[PDB]
Design a protein around this ligand. Structure first.
Ligand SMILES: [Cl-]
Ligand SMILES: [Cl-]
Ligand SMILES: [Cl-]
Lengths: 224, 219
């Protein structure tokens, strides 16, 4: 098929956070039907970043979600034409980051192009002081809206010395495939874990791993 | 012990939404350790309500959460003194609902006192026109913060014709008991399913059920 049991990926990312311009590239591979993937990420311009790499981490891959039970796979069905997404992440202490992404397929390779615009991260806050320690595992609630798919979620970013910085994520995913050709899912949930394999040189190189599984609610229902 | 295998609850609620005052009472029972409960609710003043009953649903019970794996129980451990919660619910179309709750324990019964204020619900929106069909199941993120425990989540309200109206919930849970007494949990999640069971007389009488389970992320 188009989405093989092993797929490779290449990513290009450009952006500004506050007033610092940067570029990253990455390459990796994963098991799209097992919901696992790895990316080796390099900061190739504007490094070392003067802000926590953590704020970029969710911007680096929806094709690699294991859809269990019923669920029609919005992202795998979108090929060969692919899909796009746009996200606004709003941090409770100030910081707002917009990310927009294009996912396409060429030569059997997934290609990601990402743009990033973050502003108002406080100068003395943990993001700009690089005092963060990764994301807590979480659950994204997915729901169909106008033939597209919407995601809503709160995430918690670990801080040096304990405690957390909280942010809200508001995401829209759009297929480039004509709506008549894809089966739309109902409401469902994606459990995911974002972790690092290795990092070096002040997060100038980061190897990042994700596990993700799409499911219905585990709880029993009195109506159905 | 002081929170038994079966527990009855009584509730008193007062509020105003878009300038429409109302009062509700309820009674119910559940199994705190199994994370299940039912309430039978009556609108005793200002009924029938001119807004969707659904916007009130989350204001009617944290003692009835099944704590699995390791997780220390902030709520059960807070008795006999009980606890408070306070919440802002912000709807993506402009409605804001603030609630303040007191949970106490008296003669073996759980007693809830709730006060609610709702403003800015669009006059021709789904809430004021009663076009809503209940809440999707959802997961609340729980973490230690402030003077107690905080909760965050988004909830999705089903609308007639197949859409959803989204709102965010921001909650602070404060114990009335000395913080040195209770064991404080790390970051965890509460899967909930809140289900309407019955309504009668234009939602003047409503029966509501909840299933709730505390867990870490299960990958
Ligand atoms: Cl008031
Ligand atoms: Cl009105
Ligand atoms: Cl959420």
């Amino acid at each position: 098929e188009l989405i093989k049991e092993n797929m490779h990926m290449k990513l290009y990312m450009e952006g500004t956070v506050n007033n610092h311009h940067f570029k990253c590239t990455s390459e990796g591979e994963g098991k799209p039907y097992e919901g696992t993937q790895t990316q080796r990420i390099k900061v190739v311009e504007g490094g070392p970043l003067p802000f926590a790499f953590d704020i970029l981490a969710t911007s680096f891959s929806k094709t690699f979600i294991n859809h269990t039970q019923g669920i029609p796979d919005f992202w795998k069905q979108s090929f060969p034409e692919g899909f796009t997404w746009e996200r606004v992440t709003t941090y409770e202490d100030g910081g707002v980051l917009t990310a927009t992404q294009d996912t396409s397929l060429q030569d059997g390779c997934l290609i990601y192009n990402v743009k990033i615009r973050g502003v108002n991260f406080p100068s003395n806050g943990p993001v700009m002081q690089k005092k963060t320690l990764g994301w807590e595992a979480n659950t994204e609630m997915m729901y169909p809206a106008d033939g597209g798919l919407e995601g809503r979620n709160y995430m918690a970013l670990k801080l040096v010395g304990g405690g957390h910085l909280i942010c809200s994520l508001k995401t829209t995913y759009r297929s480039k495939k004509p709506a008549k050709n894809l089966k739309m899912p109902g409401v469902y949930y994606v459990d995911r874990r974002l972790e690092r394999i290795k990092e070096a040189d002040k997060e100038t190189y980061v190897e990042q791993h994700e596990v993700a599984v799409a499911r219905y609610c585990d709880l029993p229902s009195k109506l159905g």
